[PDB]
Amino acid sequence: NKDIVTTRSNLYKKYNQVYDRSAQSFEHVDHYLTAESWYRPKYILKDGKTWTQSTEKDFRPLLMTWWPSQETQRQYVNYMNAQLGINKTYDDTSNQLQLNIAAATIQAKIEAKITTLKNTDWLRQTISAFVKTQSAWNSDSEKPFDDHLQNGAVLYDNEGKLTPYANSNYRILNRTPTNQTGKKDPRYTADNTIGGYEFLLANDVDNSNPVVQAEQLNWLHFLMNFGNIYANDPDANFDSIRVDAVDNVDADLLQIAGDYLKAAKGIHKNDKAANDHLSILEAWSDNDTPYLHDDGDNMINMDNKLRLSLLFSLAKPLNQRSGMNPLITNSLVNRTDDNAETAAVPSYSFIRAHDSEVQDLIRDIIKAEINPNVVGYSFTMEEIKKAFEIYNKDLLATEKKYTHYNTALSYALLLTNKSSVPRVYYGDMFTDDGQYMAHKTINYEAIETLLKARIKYVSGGQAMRNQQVGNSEIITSVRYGKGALKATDTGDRTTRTSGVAVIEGNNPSLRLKASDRVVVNMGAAHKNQAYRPLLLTTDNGIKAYHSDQEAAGLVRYTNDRGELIFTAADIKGYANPQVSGYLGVWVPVGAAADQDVRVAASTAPSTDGKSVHQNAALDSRVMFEGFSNFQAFATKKEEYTNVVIAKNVDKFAEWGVTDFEMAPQYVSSTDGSFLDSVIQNGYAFTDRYDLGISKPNKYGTADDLVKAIKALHSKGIKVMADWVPDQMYAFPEKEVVTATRVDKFGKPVEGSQIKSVLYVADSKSSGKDQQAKYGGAFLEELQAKYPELFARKQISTGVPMDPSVKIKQWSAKYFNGTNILGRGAGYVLKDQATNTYFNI
Numbered sequence: 001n002k003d004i005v006t007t008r009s010n011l012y013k014k015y016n017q018v019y020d021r022s023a024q025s026f027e028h029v030d031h032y033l034t035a036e037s038w039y040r041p042k043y044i045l046k047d048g049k050t051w052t053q054s055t056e057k058d059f060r061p062l063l064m065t066w067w068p069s070q071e072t073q074r075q076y077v078n079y080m081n082a083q084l085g086i087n088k089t090y091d092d093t094s095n096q097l098q099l100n101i102a103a104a105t106i107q108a109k110i111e112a113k114i115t116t117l118k119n120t121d122w123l124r125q126t127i128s129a130f131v132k133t134q135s136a137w138n139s140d141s142e143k144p145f146d147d148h149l150q151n152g153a154v155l156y157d158n159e160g161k162l163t164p165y166a167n168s169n170y171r172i173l174n175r176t177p178t179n180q181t182g183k184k185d186p187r188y189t190a191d192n193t194i195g196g197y198e199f200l201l202a203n204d205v206d207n208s209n210p211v212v213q214a215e216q217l218n219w220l221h222f223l224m225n226f227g228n229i230y231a232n233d234p235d236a237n238f239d240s241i242r243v244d245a246v247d248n249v250d251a252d253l254l255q256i257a258g259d260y261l262k263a264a265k266g267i268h269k270n271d272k273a274a275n276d277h278l279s280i281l282e283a284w285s286d287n288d289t290p291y292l293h294d295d296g297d298n299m300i301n302m303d304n305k306l307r308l309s310l311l312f313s314l315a316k317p318l319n320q321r322s323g324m325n326p327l328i329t330n331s332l333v334n335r336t337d338d339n340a341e342t343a344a345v346p347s348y349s350f351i352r353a354h355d356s357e358v359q360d361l362i363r364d365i366i367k368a369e370i371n372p373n374v375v376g377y378s379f380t381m382e383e384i385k386k387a388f389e390i391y392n393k394d395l396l397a398t399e400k401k402y403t404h405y406n407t408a409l410s411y412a413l414l415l416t417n418k419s420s421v422p423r424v425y426y427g428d429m430f431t432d433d434g435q436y437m438a439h440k441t442i443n444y445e446a447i448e449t450l451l452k453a454r455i456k457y458v459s460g461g462q463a464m465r466n467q468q469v470g471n472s473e474i475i476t477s478v479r480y481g482k483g484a485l486k487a488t489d490t491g492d493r494t495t496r497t498s499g500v501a502v503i504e505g506n507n508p509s510l511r512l513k514a515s516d517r518v519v520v521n522m523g524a525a526h527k528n529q530a531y532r533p534l535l536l537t538t539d540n541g542i543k544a545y546h547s548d549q550e551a552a553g554l555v556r557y558t559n560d561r562g563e564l565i566f567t568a569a570d571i572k573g574y575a576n577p578q579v580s581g582y583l584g585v586w587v588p589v590g591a592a593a594d595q596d597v598r599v600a601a602s603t604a605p606s607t608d609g610k611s612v613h614q615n616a617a618l619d620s621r622v623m624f625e626g627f628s629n630f631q632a633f634a635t636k637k638e639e640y641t642n643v644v645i646a647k648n649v650d651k652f653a654e655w656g657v658t659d660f661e662m663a664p665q666y667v668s669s670t671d672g673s674f675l676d677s678v679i680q681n682g683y684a685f686t687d688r689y690d691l692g693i694s695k696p697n698k699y700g701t702a703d704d705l706v707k708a709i710k711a712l713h714s715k716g717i718k719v720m721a722d723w724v725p726d727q728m729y730a731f732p733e734k735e736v737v738t739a740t741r742v743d744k745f746g747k748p749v750e751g752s753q754i755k756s757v758l759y760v761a762d763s764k765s766s767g768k769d770q771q772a773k774y775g776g777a778f779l780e781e782l783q784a785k786y787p788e789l790f791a792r793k794q795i796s797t798g799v800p801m802d803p804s805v806k807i808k809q810w811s812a813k814y815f816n817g818t819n820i821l822g823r824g825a826g827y828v829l830k831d832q833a834t835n836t837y838f839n840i
């Protein structure tokens with residue numbers, strides 16, 4: 001209640017009283033005081049000598065003259081004595097007068113050191129360190145930890161009497177696509193659970209708040225007009241988006257993004273529009289794909305079934321590997337005989353991504369050889385570097401203990417499968433660490449060969465076969481050639497010189513019997529035809545054939561029925577750094593050097609109520625995830641990722657890349673509280689609009705980004721922006737909130753001292769950043785052009801988006817809560833007499 005009276009505390013107690021009752025003599029947060037707060041007293045004991053008359057800019061720790069309890073005063077006195085070379089300690093029976101005289105001595109010698117040592121910085125550090133020793137002011141009162149990635153979270157109370165500026169009518173949690181109405185959707189049964197959880201990392205954005213929802217749409221419009229807005233260059237806009245962390249945010253965002261793409265880009269009218277803005281989800285629940293399909297196929301999800309199938313049938317260690325038939329049937333699309341003009345559901349397919357099956361491997365290495373107590377993905381840079389030593393040796397072993405086997409086999413399937421958009425991971429062609437595109441992996445040659453051949457040969461219907469041979473099994477996968485959807489189609493000239501056969505085994509012990517025959521039906525267009533190898537497993541790796549002349553001596557022929565026939569002389573198991581099993585790829589002889597069997601999207605009207613259609617034109621696309629979490633930091637400008645991308649767009653065009661998925665371009669925060677802010681990938685940020693504008697991002701300056709987008713567009717490659725509405729990191733201004741310790745679903749942890757309790761968070765942006773410039777700056781334009789976006793009543797809330805408020809400054813009122821900050825349950829100071837919080 002406004003008046004810190006200093007009585008029976010410190011011998012010097014009438015000089016230490018507060019300068020005035022003004023708030024400007026206290027370092028306060030929302031007019032509360034913290035254990036680390038400093039204040040301006042009336043007099044300063046200058047050099048610990050003379051009670052200097054004035055105080056001006058002379059702020060001193062409040063813990064120098066005031067304490068919450070006598071026990072804390074004693075702890076402070078013992079601590080500060082040790083810090084200042086005063087060899088006296090006071091145990092739990094010493095009395096008040098002794099403590100006040102000790103505190104006076106400590107004050108005097110503090111002021112001596114302040115005038116000796118130039119500044120007060122050391123005192124800030126020493127006071128905060130002491131405060132961290134106190135359980136009411138550190139992690140101890142925030143325990144027990146839980147399986148939140150960062151050990152826990154607190155949820156901000158919607159009605160806090162002491163913090164009404166942080167109140168909310170929303171904070172509706174866990175409204176995943178499965179759980180969007182607050183009840184588990186009865187349509188979707190592949191996932192038993194509620195399909196996600198609200199609290200993932202750092203400060204959790206409340207995407208149930210209509211004002212926030214509107215600001216998310218503002219941001220989306222900004223990214224898709226980045227060229228126009230920042231550089232007045234319409235050739236430098238992002239073309240599409242990736243929706244990050246779908247299962248940790250309110251699913252209303254899916255309708256908002258879809259609606260926006262329909263209204264602003266017309267993706268629902270024809271395939272040309274849709275494919276010009278092909279947008280994706282990172283949505284891990286198996287309900288998300290049927291959900292997104294019922295929603296209109298306005299975006300596409302990953303095929304997680306196919307992914308797991310590749311992982312467990314090919315990538316895992318030999319003794320943990322599953323049988324091979326899942327590669328055919330355990331997918332969105334059963335590829336036994338895929339003869340459809342248009343598959344039932346669109347999707348993209350991958351084996352590794354910047355996060356998936358990379359940071360998992362680094363964590364495995366750390367947990368098993370460095371620090372067994374590693375928490376989630378909260379690595380230190382030192383742990384990361386020691387782990388990449390192990391990782392990089394394992395990559396080249398024949399017997400891998402940590403990294404994937406059979407990468408080239410995985411890509412042989414991904415890049416010749418029908419009915420999916422493959423997404424190539426950067427770190428599978430180039431090293432996961434090091435400078436951008438500086439070092440090829442051992443699989444670069446095979447993968448590049450596959451990408452080029454995909455342009456030239458991959459089209460038509462598909463047939464996958466699983467054949468038990470000798471002591472093991474193989475699969476064949478065949479594409480019939482352009483224009484041949486069914487195996488009986490005899491084709492035209494281009495059919496004859498396209499199509500492909502892939503043969504794989506996942507067991508190095510594979511031995512065929514002398515009587516075994518692998519009869520690969522190529523299709524009715526390929527009777528009595530010469531075929532040559534594209535990829536062949538060898539003893540030490542994979543031989544790639546880049547031309548018909550490079551393979552001139554290995555030609556073989558189909559019989560009169562269009563069958564290639566293989567025996568033990570052709571197929572056996574191998575064990576080398578690239579293959580644990582067997583891989584062979586064959587193409588028909590004689591395709592023109594410029595043969596291109598891809599197909600452009602039609603402008604014919606769409607008539608089935610979906611926007612994206614998995615047909616030959618979409619199957620003609622290739623997505624490229626163009627970064628690695630663990631890229632080195634550029635040492636000179638020519639090593640900047642976006643600079644290098646601009647310098648190699650010819651390479652991406654020759655690989656058939658149609659969609660370049662760039663890293664998130666937001667300037668990263670540097671708090672190091674998660675992997676993303678340690679290696680600074682772009683997913684941990686404080687300013688949604690700072691795309692390398694105030695400072696370069698890890699990939700270059702904003703002009704480097706503009707030039708990279710233009711260079712990609714100059715080859716017809718579309719460019720994808722990473723929409724990250726889940727969380728934000730490292731806000732520069734503190735705020736006092738009413739909070740409750742919770743699990744990642746928002747359920748309160750009992751036995752917790754944080755329960756409708758004052759808590760100090762970092763949750764205000766500066767008001768002088770890009771957010772303050774652009775926040776809500778396009779809502780009037782968007783409402784004017786597209787009123788129906790603001791008319792829709794969103795599913796989770798029952799109301800429209802609310803664009804009547806612009807978010808120029810983030811504040812706790814717009815967030816569900818935060819990961820625990822190690823500040824404790826009692827950081828906000830109370831008058832001990834009245835058990836009342838101090839306020840000004």
Ligand SMILES: C[C@H]1O[C@H](O[C@H]2[C@H](O)[C@@H](O)[C@@H](O[C@H]3[C@H](O)[C@@H](O)[C@@H](O)O[C@@H]3CO)O[C@@H]2CO)[C@H](O)[C@@H](O)[C@@H]1N[C@H]1C=C(CO)[C@@H](O)[C@H](O)[C@H]1O
Nearest residue numbers: 244245246247248282284285286308355356676683724726
């Ligand atoms: C942090 C990163 O992963 C997050 O999701 C993880 C899931 O919680 C895992 O369980 C795993 O999914 C399995 C499902 O739980 C399971 O039910 C099944 O349906 O599918 C999986 C097993 O087959 O997947 C994730 C492991 O990475 C989170 O949802 C995801 O969005 C996160 N990655 C992006 C987001 C951020 C934060 O902005 C960044 O940390 C990353 O770099 C982004 O890529």
Ligand SMILES: [Ca+2]
Nearest residue numbers: 198204248249
């Ligand atoms: Ca969330």
